[PDB]
């Protein structure tokens, strides 16, 4: 099946796409404000043939000037100067297409060529172009240098890192970077041909020596396991700490990493790491070092092995104080044994004799992320992260988003932070050459 083209959606009235500036990790986000509706650019002339003389060895492409009418994610609606109607307006992918600052062609000694449809309007287009372009906005000359510098991943193939075992989430397992697409890494577990996709900014991948330092469960080859126990000796293929994104510093804590914030037994809410459509009561099972802690989803069946425990850092945007769902009108997943109609936090804390973790332990500042209900975007299927799909913002709960996959039932909706690295602007797949899943037939 083919990758889904946004084209028919773009060609509809009131189509709403989240702007690139909503996605901090997205390429071009930093310089995107240098773009604007009404700006003028040199763009490829598709409506002309061998009018321009091209010497052998030169690129056989001709350019004309256009105005950007609309911007939807990476998509821009172009309109050639000289046209009276919108008959030849066309959509482009901004960071794929040959779009340039006005004056780019002249630097290469190339002339601008009027499209055939309007070429007759003038013998010399100087007066028209001077009249249309004087005082107008165009692209900064360094624009695409900035874009290209934002395409490269911080990682490369062959790097070894510790990442969560999808078959046993209570431990991290040694894995190697074998594929990179648009900064989404494929990590193949050592001594196996299985693995998973995740963005380079994912909180479930960690540098070499992380598990040992933090105190997380670790599965790895013997030689690696024994190398960790000493300390600490380095290796050429070790993924180091500066490659990894954190919203905190190891210096915030002491050198020993002793933390006394979250405590074992404390109750809270959290997104089910095995079901991103669900938010349910959770319990701190073990406090590790440097803010990391193992928690248990209370909706799970009884399990003393602690194999289904999951590590969240205390500054994670995916853990919430008790009462988060009820306060925001979210249907909470009842803890095992309880019913939807028979569950309250007050009664639940009574029966377990437990204490809910205080609001002060949570760090959830709410930015004006700019996300709105109805906005379209591209979102990774967190259940099958090899897939990136057509998606819509269904709800906005402070800084938490409910993301709906267009064409599917609301049961597949996933909870994602506004600054998650699993959501992307419209046109991202085209830019990075990832396949986009469209709505089911």
């Amino acid at each position: 099946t083919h990758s889904y083209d946004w084209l028919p959606r773009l060609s509809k009235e009131n189509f709403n796409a989240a702007p690139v500036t909503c996605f901090p990790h997205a390429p071009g986000c930093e310089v995107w404000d240098n773009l604007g509706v009404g700006m003028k650019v040199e763009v490829e002339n598709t409506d002309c043939d061998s009018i321009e003389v091209i010497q052998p060895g030169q690129t056989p492409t001709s350019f004309w000037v256009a105005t950007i009418l609309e911007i939807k994610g990476y998509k821009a609606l172009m309109s050639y100067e000289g046209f009276d109607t919108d008959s030849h307006d066309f959509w482009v992918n901004l960071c794929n297409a040959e779009v340039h600052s006005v004056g780019w062609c002249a630097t290469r000694g190339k002339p601008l060529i009027p499209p055939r449809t309007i070429e007759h309007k003038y013998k010399d287009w100087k007066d028209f172009l001077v009249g249309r372009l004087s005082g107008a906005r165009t692209l900064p000359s360094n624009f695409y240098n900035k874009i290209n510098d934002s395409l490269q991943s911080r990682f490369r193939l062959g790097l070894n890192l510790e990442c969560v075992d999808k078959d046993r989430i209570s431990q991290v397992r040694l894995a190697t970077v074998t594929k990179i697409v648009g900064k989404r890494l494929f990590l193949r577990y050592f001594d196996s041909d299985d693995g998973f996709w995740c963005h380079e900014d994912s909180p479930i991948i960690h540098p070499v020596g992380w598990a040992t330092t933090v105190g997380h469960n670790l599965a790895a080859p013997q030689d690696y396991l024994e190398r960790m126990l000493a300390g600490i000796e380095v290796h050429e293929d070790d993924a180091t700490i500066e490659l990894f994104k954190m919203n905190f510093t190891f210096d915030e804590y002491y050198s020993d990493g002793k933390t006394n914030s979250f405590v074992e037994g404390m109750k809270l809410e959290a997104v089910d790491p095995l079901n991103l459509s669900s938010i349910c009561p959770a319990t701190v099972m073990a406090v590790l070092k440097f803010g990391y802690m193992m928690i248990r989803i209370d909706s799970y069946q009884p399990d003393a092995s602690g194999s289904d425990w999951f590590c969240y850092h205390e500054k994670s945007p995916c853990i919430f104080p008790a009462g988060f769902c009820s306060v925001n009108n979210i249907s909470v997943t009842p803890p095992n044994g309880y019913d939807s109609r028979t569950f309250t936090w007050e009664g639940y804390l009574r029966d377990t004799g437990a204490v809910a973790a205080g609001q002060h332990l949570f760090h959830r500042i709410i930015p004006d992320h700019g996300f709105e209900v109805g906005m379209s975007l591209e979102c990774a299927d967190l259940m099958d992260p090899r897939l990136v799909c057509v998606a819509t913002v269904a709800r906005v709960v402070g800084r938490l988003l409910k993301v709906h996959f267009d064409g599917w039932t609301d049961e597949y909706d996933q909870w994602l932070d506004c600054e998650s690295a699993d959501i992307y602007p419209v046109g991202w797949c085209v830019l990075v050459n990832h396949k986009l899943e469209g709505p089911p037939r």
């Binding site: 240098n34 060529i113 001077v130």
Partner: peptide, 30 residues
Amino acid sequence: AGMASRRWEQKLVHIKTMEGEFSVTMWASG
């Protein structure tokens, strides 16, 4: 945006056609 808020510059641009060359005064962010 610019010129209201952030940084912007005037930029003189060179344009060629098959009838001649000329200059236009435009602007861009940064």
